[PDB]
A and B are shown apart, each in its own frame.
With several copies, the nearest count.
Chain A
Amino acid sequence: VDVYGNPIRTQQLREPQTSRLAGLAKEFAQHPAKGLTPAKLARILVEAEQGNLQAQAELFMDMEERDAHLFAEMSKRKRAILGLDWAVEPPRNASAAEKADADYLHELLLDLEGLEDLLLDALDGIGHGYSCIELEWALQGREWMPLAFHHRPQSWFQLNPEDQNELRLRDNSPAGEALQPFGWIIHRPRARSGYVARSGLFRVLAWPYLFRHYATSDLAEMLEIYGLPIRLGKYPPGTADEEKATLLRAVTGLGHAAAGIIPETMAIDFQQAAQGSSDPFLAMMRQSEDAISKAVLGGTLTSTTSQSGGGAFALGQVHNEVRHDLLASDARQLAATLSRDLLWPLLVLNRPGSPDVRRAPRLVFDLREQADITSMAQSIPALVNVGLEIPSAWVYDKLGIPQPA
């Protein structure tokens, strides 16, 4: 069975759950970001709270695509995880059989192509609040294998009417369809405590995005109007339609044309077009960008930048507060999700027996922080000459150097 105890039947693993839903694969995103107003955004969020996640997912995708600063921040945050070395470790004080199981799982993950793509797809749940990856199960003789990992759009799911924390497929029915066991890797990182609909970071970032969009569009319009002044022509009674058209064309082309002549009975008045500055717009854009940076990566390095300054402890100063905390949180949540969803089916299908769930191997990301070799290498000799018996295992582990074999 799975970790949650639901019965597992190997018959349903031959075909993906969504195969019998050919309607989903033919859908196109509705792009709800175009022509978006604060009222529309509020309605979208409220409806999403009630189980209509399609519009929210499409809006989040548009928001990711249309904002360069937000996209850069999210990409940097995800690439931070994608570059971490990982390993599979056996449970606490594991036995020889458990160690062998962990070693086999580690070897299987090393030789499993598409792991990086799986991690990238799973990390989308950081912003979207939940990411679902469908599994393709195949048999190369007697051992089950994940053939491929398919990332399904968040717009394909909904909320259970009887449960606000349980996701279901959109199968044209009011209650949707329950997710098949062992058929998905659902990643639901928890930045804030609440239901799944409210758990996305883009829900926090939506309003600054709209503020920045409005400011940028208004600035573009004002830059378009800038330049020549608006000038209005006046004509006396008894001016025919042809003369009216001639005066109109003359006024229209007068800005580009340096000189022109009109009868003394006519008049042209040059009125202010748009006089001001870009200061308010740019102030709003900077405020929104700082808010986005703080919300995504913390207000110590991105928005209120940590500035330059090297040194042996500079790495620690830059990392440990804010950056290390965020990195560790994301890595730990991703590792927990993976150990729950991918490691367990492999252990319970590819190996004999029914090992207890509490003793399953856990995937661990390498969060080791580079320690100053020179300072500590200076420090040891004094301590050892004093008489302290420092274990070599601690040194080898903390320095990153492996133990002799």
Chain B
Amino acid sequence: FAPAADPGAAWYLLDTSRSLKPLIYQERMKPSFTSMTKEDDEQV
């Protein structure tokens, strides 16, 4: 169906990920974007 046999104790781990940058939070609060003065009262 969807199998995979991998080692875990080796110096390398299969399918290695890459957390290049953290989970930075991007926000649209108030007088920081135009969505809220020259637009509706929208925030993303």
Interface residue tally on B, bucketed by range: 10 to 19
Number of A-B contacts (CB under 8 A): 29
Q: With A50-B32, A161-B29, A161-B30 in contact, do A174 and B22 touch (Cβ < 8 Å)? A: no
B9 CB contacts on chain A under 8 angstroms: 173
Question: Are A28 and B22 within 8 A (Cβ)?
Answer: yes
Across the interface, do A26 and B19 meet the contact criterion of CB distance under 8 Å? Answer: yes
Q: Identify which of residues 163-203 in chain A touch chain B, using a CB-to-CB cut-off of 8 Å.
A: 170-174
The verdict on B10 contacting chain A, using a C-beta distance below 8 Å, is yes
Q: Is the CB of A172 within 8 A of B22?
A: no
Query: Is B1 an interface residue when CB atoms closer than 8 A count as contact?
Result: no
Within 8 A of B (CB), among A39-54: 50
Tally A residues with Cβ within 8 Å of B. 12
Contact between B32 and A172, CB atoms less than 8 A apart: no
The answer on a CB contact under 8 Å between A26 and B30 is no
CB distance from A131 to the nearest CB of B (A): 21
Task: Given contact pairs A170-B25, A174-B12, enumerate 4 new A-B contacts (beta carbons under 8 Å).
Answer: A23-B22, A28-B21, A172-B11, A173-B10
Question: Which residues from chain A sit less than 8 Å from chain B, CB to CB?
Answer: 23, 26-28, 30, 50, 161, 170-174
Q: Which residues of B contact A (CB under 8 A)?
A: 9-13, 16, 19, 21-23, 25, 27, 29-30, 32, 43
Please name 14 pairs of A and B residues whose Cβ atoms are closer than 8 Å in the assembled complex, sorted by A: A26-B22, A27-B22, A30-B21, A50-B32, A161-B29, A161-B30, A171-B11, A172-B10, A172-B23, A172-B25, A173-B9, A173-B11, A174-B11, A174-B29
